């Protein structure tokens, strides 16, 4: 047990607020310490604060003291995290970690250290709005092995997922990290390698999902006659 | 605030070596409250090491911590291929806790040159108004890739992003993807489209290139 599990991501816009949830499955919900900490995209981890429900005692991280409130539900074993003023600055994945312990109860000591973690909350702070994307082929050049793949420009927001032929294509595959472009929209590049002889033969379809837009679009990807 | 700083940034080892990994903080951690995380892409953070040196049950014993006061170190004897991510060093004895920006350890191989790619944007595309020039660089070793983009032999500056993927599991190598984002009255305001890329792999900076409309 001792099986902490968060919310669904968020996608809020700035100066609003955000609530992060994090249920703690079996064990003992009121004795230790659940702290929060986050992870910016690319970036390390740095601990906002932590709570312990028992004593009722709270203690926040600086950078976020007074623009951050965490409580503590021992009715539902559930600690909570609010974020306001929110900024594109705070767009991250949230995690709530309890501490450790040796032993259970008057026997040992918490370790402090942060031993049980959350699958995390990723939480996008933007004022653009959800969009299905756009669909380009990359065509496998007319010009042994080649290259083609589809780009997924222009949606927001994350993820996009890409599977090519229904899944019957998996090694070669290469679905790039997405960029947020200035305009404030993501887009990936997903590509995968085929042996040239196959290409004016085999049809390959790269199937781009994007659930939070709730859109479905598969595009074949055909060389470029000219 | 006490400032932990891990050394190195980026580490590459081959599947069996041992890996050692450097923590400093600014001034002294009380009670030797040292920490350390294992953090696979994806996934959530792990606890390896507590007191500094204290290995939780279920952890490998090819794990060790050691360093007491200002400079620690976490040691991996034989480096399985599942070791093979980001590691962070953490203090926890003081009201406010900090990390360290963290150490890749990422695997060593024989250099691999990149299968370069590009690939015109699509009259669909162009018909919108914007115009998508893709860089592929395909399957290389180490990470370390220079992309250049030359239209009608001319640099370019703030108007391409480029993403890579993580080391490949199988084969340990990177791939990476530019862009080059123009508009349709610039785009077709020129003639040849090239991408330069310069790698350990490559003697010769290898150049591809098309033509519009052709």
């Known amino acids: 047990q001792v099986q902490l599990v968060q919310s669904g991501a968020e996608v809020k816009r700035p100066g609003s607020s955000v609530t992060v949830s994090c249920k703690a499955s079996g064990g003992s919900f009121s004795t230790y310490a659940l702290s929060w900490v986050r992870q910016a995209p690319g970036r390390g981890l740095e601990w906002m604060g932590g709570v312990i429900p028992l004593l009722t005692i709270t203690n926040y991280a600086p950078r976020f003291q007074g623009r951050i409130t965490i409580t503590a539900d021992r009715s539902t074993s559930t600690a909570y995290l609010e974020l306001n003023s929110l900024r594109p600055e705070d767009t991250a994945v949230y995690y709530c970690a309890r501490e450790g312990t040796t032993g259970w109860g008057w026997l040992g000591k918490p370790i402090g250290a942060f031993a049980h973690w959350g699958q995390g909350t990723l939480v996008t702070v933007s004022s653009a709005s959800t969009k299905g994307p756009s669909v380009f082929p990359l065509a496998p050049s007319s010009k042994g092995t080649a290259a083609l793949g589809c780009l997924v420009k222009d949606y927001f927001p994350e993820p996009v997922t890409v599977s090519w032929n229904s899944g019957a294509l998996t090694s070669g595959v290469h679905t790039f990290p997405a960029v947020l472009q200035s305009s404030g929209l993501y887009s990936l590049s997903s590509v995968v390698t085929v042996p040239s002889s196959s290409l004016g033969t085999q049809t390959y379809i790269c199937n781009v999902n994007h659930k939070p837009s709730n859109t479905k679009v598969d595009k074949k990807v055909e060389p470029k006659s000219c | 605030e006490i400032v932990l700083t891990q050394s190195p940034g980026t580490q590459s080892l081959s599947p069996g070596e041992r890996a050692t990994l450097s923590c400093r903080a600014s001034?002294?951690?009380?009670?030797?409250?040292l920490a350390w995380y294992q953090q696979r892409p994806g996934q959530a953070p792990r606890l390896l090491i507590y007191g500094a040196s204290s290995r939780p049950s279920g952890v490998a014993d090819r794990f060790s911590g050691s360093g007491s006061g200002t400079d620690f170190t976490l040691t991996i004897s034989r480096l399985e291929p599942e070791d093979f991510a980001v590691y962070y060093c953490q203090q926890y004895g003081q009201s406010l806790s900090t990390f360290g920006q963290g150490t890749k350890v990422e695997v060593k191989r024989t250099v691999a040159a990149p299968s370069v790619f590009i690939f015109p944007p699509s009259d669909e595309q162009l018909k919108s108004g914007t115009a998508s020039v893709v860089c592929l660089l395909n399957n290389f070793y180490p990470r370390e890739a220079k992309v250049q983009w030359k239209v009608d032999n001319a640099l370019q500056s703030g108007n391409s992003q480029e993403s890579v993927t993580e080391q490949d599991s199988k084969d340990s190598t990177y791939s990476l993807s530019s862009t080059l984002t123009l508009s349709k009255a610039d785009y077709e305001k020129h003639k040849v489209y090239a991408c330069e890329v310069t790698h350990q792999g490559l003697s010769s900076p290898v150049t591809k290139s098309f033509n519009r409309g052709e």
């Open positions: 001034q002294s951690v009380g009670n030797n409250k």
